[PDB]
PDB file of all heavy atoms in Angstrom:
ATOM      1  N   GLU B 339     -10.664  21.759  10.799  1.00 56.86           N
ATOM      2  CA  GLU B 339     -10.924  22.942   9.988  1.00 56.86           C
ATOM      3  C   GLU B 339     -11.600  22.585   8.676  1.00 56.86           C
ATOM      4  O   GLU B 339     -12.397  23.354   8.160  1.00 56.86           O
ATOM      5  CB  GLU B 339      -9.619  23.681   9.733  1.00 56.86           C
ATOM      6  CG  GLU B 339      -9.123  24.374  11.003  1.00 56.86           C
ATOM      7  CD  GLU B 339      -7.856  25.156  10.752  1.00 56.86           C
ATOM      8  OE1 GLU B 339      -7.060  24.743   9.873  1.00 56.86           O
ATOM      9  OE2 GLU B 339      -7.662  26.175  11.423  1.00 56.86           O
ATOM     10  N   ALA B 340     -11.257  21.419   8.150  1.00 53.78           N
ATOM     11  CA  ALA B 340     -11.868  20.958   6.884  1.00 53.78           C
ATOM     12  C   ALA B 340     -13.363  20.734   7.021  1.00 53.78           C
ATOM     13  O   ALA B 340     -14.143  21.071   6.116  1.00 53.78           O
ATOM     14  CB  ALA B 340     -11.178  19.688   6.416  1.00 53.78           C
ATOM     15  N   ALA B 341     -13.787  20.164   8.151  1.00 54.62           N
ATOM     16  CA  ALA B 341     -15.202  19.924   8.384  1.00 54.62           C
ATOM     17  C   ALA B 341     -15.963  21.244   8.475  1.00 54.62           C
ATOM     18  O   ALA B 341     -17.129  21.333   8.085  1.00 54.62           O
ATOM     19  CB  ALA B 341     -15.417  19.146   9.683  1.00 54.62           C
ATOM     20  N   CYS B 342     -15.307  22.272   9.004  1.00 51.81           N
ATOM     21  CA  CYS B 342     -15.943  23.573   9.129  1.00 51.81           C
ATOM     22  C   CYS B 342     -16.067  24.249   7.788  1.00 51.81           C
ATOM     23  O   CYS B 342     -17.093  24.845   7.486  1.00 51.81           O
ATOM     24  CB  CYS B 342     -15.114  24.464  10.088  1.00 51.81           C
ATOM     25  SG  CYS B 342     -15.117  23.899  11.818  1.00 51.81           S
ATOM     26  N   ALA B 343     -14.983  24.146   6.990  1.00 52.06           N
ATOM     27  CA  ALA B 343     -14.972  24.745   5.652  1.00 52.06           C
ATOM     28  C   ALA B 343     -16.078  24.102   4.787  1.00 52.06           C
ATOM     29  O   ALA B 343     -16.802  24.789   4.071  1.00 52.06           O
ATOM     30  CB  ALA B 343     -13.588  24.528   5.000  1.00 52.06           C
ATOM     31  N   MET B 344     -16.193  22.771   4.854  1.00 52.80           N
ATOM     32  CA  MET B 344     -17.236  22.062   4.119  1.00 52.80           C
ATOM     33  C   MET B 344     -18.613  22.677   4.443  1.00 52.80           C
ATOM     34  O   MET B 344     -19.328  23.131   3.555  1.00 52.80           O
ATOM     35  CB  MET B 344     -17.270  20.574   4.474  1.00 52.80           C
ATOM     36  CG  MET B 344     -18.602  19.885   4.201  1.00 52.80           C
ATOM     37  SD  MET B 344     -18.798  18.352   5.136  1.00 52.80           S
ATOM     38  CE  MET B 344     -19.474  19.024   6.661  1.00 52.80           C
ATOM     39  N   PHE B 345     -18.893  22.692   5.741  1.00 53.08           N
ATOM     40  CA  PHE B 345     -20.160  23.207   6.268  1.00 53.08           C
ATOM     41  C   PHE B 345     -20.481  24.628   5.808  1.00 53.08           C
ATOM     42  O   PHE B 345     -21.573  24.904   5.372  1.00 53.08           O
ATOM     43  CB  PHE B 345     -20.127  23.211   7.815  1.00 53.08           C
ATOM     44  CG  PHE B 345     -21.450  23.557   8.446  1.00 53.08           C
ATOM     45  CD1 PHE B 345     -22.372  22.551   8.766  1.00 53.08           C
ATOM     46  CD2 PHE B 345     -21.747  24.874   8.764  1.00 53.08           C
ATOM     47  CE1 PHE B 345     -23.587  22.863   9.366  1.00 53.08           C
ATOM     48  CE2 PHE B 345     -22.987  25.193   9.372  1.00 53.08           C
ATOM     49  CZ  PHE B 345     -23.889  24.169   9.673  1.00 53.08           C
ATOM     50  N   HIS B 346     -19.518  25.521   5.935  1.00 54.69           N
ATOM     51  CA  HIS B 346     -19.732  26.923   5.598  1.00 54.69           C
ATOM     52  C   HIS B 346     -19.549  27.346   4.148  1.00 54.69           C
ATOM     53  O   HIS B 346     -20.168  28.295   3.705  1.00 54.69           O
ATOM     54  CB  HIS B 346     -18.830  27.798   6.472  1.00 54.69           C
ATOM     55  CG  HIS B 346     -19.180  27.777   7.931  1.00 54.69           C
ATOM     56  ND1 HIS B 346     -20.237  28.485   8.447  1.00 54.69           N
ATOM     57  CD2 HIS B 346     -18.630  27.106   8.954  1.00 54.69           C
ATOM     58  CE1 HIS B 346     -20.330  28.249   9.742  1.00 54.69           C
ATOM     59  NE2 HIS B 346     -19.361  27.387  10.077  1.00 54.69           N
ATOM     60  N   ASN B 347     -18.685  26.647   3.423  1.00 58.38           N
ATOM     61  CA  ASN B 347     -18.388  27.043   2.074  1.00 58.38           C
ATOM     62  C   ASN B 347     -18.993  26.250   0.896  1.00 58.38           C
ATOM     63  O   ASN B 347     -18.994  26.755  -0.214  1.00 58.38           O
ATOM     64  CB  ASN B 347     -16.853  27.101   1.889  1.00 58.38           C
ATOM     65  CG  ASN B 347     -16.214  27.974   2.932  1.00 58.38           C
ATOM     66  OD1 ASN B 347     -14.990  27.917   3.147  1.00 58.38           O
ATOM     67  ND2 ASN B 347     -16.991  28.816   3.578  1.00 58.38           N
ATOM     68  N   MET B 348     -19.502  25.039   1.124  1.00 60.04           N
ATOM     69  CA  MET B 348     -20.077  24.308  -0.003  1.00 60.04           C
ATOM     70  C   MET B 348     -21.371  24.908  -0.492  1.00 60.04           C
ATOM     71  O   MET B 348     -22.091  25.560   0.232  1.00 60.04           O
ATOM     72  CB  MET B 348     -20.290  22.845   0.364  1.00 60.04           C
ATOM     73  CG  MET B 348     -19.053  21.986   0.190  1.00 60.04           C
ATOM     74  SD  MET B 348     -19.433  20.235   0.404  1.00 60.04           S
ATOM     75  CE  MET B 348     -17.863  19.641   1.052  1.00 60.04           C
ATOM     76  N   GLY B 349     -21.653  24.648  -1.775  1.00 57.87           N
ATOM     77  CA  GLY B 349     -22.901  25.140  -2.375  1.00 57.87           C
ATOM     78  C   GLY B 349     -24.011  24.219  -2.015  1.00 57.87           C
ATOM     79  O   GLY B 349     -23.788  23.165  -1.396  1.00 57.87           O
ATOM     80  N   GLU B 350     -25.236  24.551  -2.439  1.00 56.92           N
ATOM     81  CA  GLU B 350     -26.397  23.712  -2.156  1.00 56.92           C
ATOM     82  C   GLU B 350     -27.057  23.131  -3.385  1.00 56.92           C
ATOM     83  O   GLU B 350     -27.103  23.760  -4.430  1.00 56.92           O
ATOM     84  CB  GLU B 350     -27.416  24.540  -1.350  1.00 56.92           C
ATOM     85  CG  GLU B 350     -26.795  25.248  -0.185  1.00 56.92           C
ATOM     86  CD  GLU B 350     -27.804  26.010   0.619  1.00 56.92           C
ATOM     87  OE1 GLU B 350     -28.506  26.861   0.040  1.00 56.92           O
ATOM     88  OE2 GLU B 350     -27.884  25.761   1.861  1.00 56.92           O
ATOM     89  N   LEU B 351     -27.599  21.912  -3.222  1.00 56.17           N
ATOM     90  CA  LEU B 351     -28.269  21.219  -4.305  1.00 56.17           C
ATOM     91  C   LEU B 351     -29.428  22.009  -4.940  1.00 56.17           C
ATOM     92  O   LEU B 351     -29.480  22.154  -6.172  1.00 56.17           O
ATOM     93  CB  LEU B 351     -28.816  19.881  -3.783  1.00 56.17           C
ATOM     94  CG  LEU B 351     -27.804  18.778  -3.449  1.00 56.17           C
ATOM     95  CD1 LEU B 351     -28.445  17.737  -2.511  1.00 56.17           C
ATOM     96  CD2 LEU B 351     -27.308  18.100  -4.749  1.00 56.17           C
ATOM     97  N   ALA B 352     -30.315  22.534  -4.097  1.00 55.60           N
ATOM     98  CA  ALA B 352     -31.462  23.287  -4.585  1.00 55.60           C
ATOM     99  C   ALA B 352     -31.059  24.438  -5.470  1.00 55.60           C
ATOM    100  O   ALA B 352     -31.753  24.744  -6.446  1.00 55.60           O
ATOM    101  CB  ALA B 352     -32.282  23.795  -3.393  1.00 55.60           C
ATOM    102  N   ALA B 353     -29.934  25.069  -5.143  1.00 54.58           N
ATOM    103  CA  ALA B 353     -29.395  26.203  -5.865  1.00 54.58           C
ATOM    104  C   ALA B 353     -28.986  25.820  -7.302  1.00 54.58           C
ATOM    105  O   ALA B 353     -28.820  26.688  -8.176  1.00 54.58           O
ATOM    106  CB  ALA B 353     -28.215  26.768  -5.139  1.00 54.58           C
ATOM    107  N   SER B 354     -28.781  24.522  -7.513  1.00 57.17           N
ATOM    108  CA  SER B 354     -28.377  24.013  -8.826  1.00 57.17           C
ATOM    109  C   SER B 354     -29.510  23.166  -9.393  1.00 57.17           C
ATOM    110  O   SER B 354     -29.331  22.446 -10.381  1.00 57.17           O
ATOM    111  CB  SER B 354     -27.115  23.192  -8.717  1.00 57.17           C
ATOM    112  OG  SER B 354     -25.996  23.991  -8.381  1.00 57.17           O
TER     113      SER B 354
END
Side-chain angles (χ1 to χ4, degrees):
Chain B
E339 288 183 327
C342 293
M344 158 200 86
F345 188 91
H346 293 283
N347 306 164
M348 277 188 210
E350 310 183 305
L351 289 161
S354 292

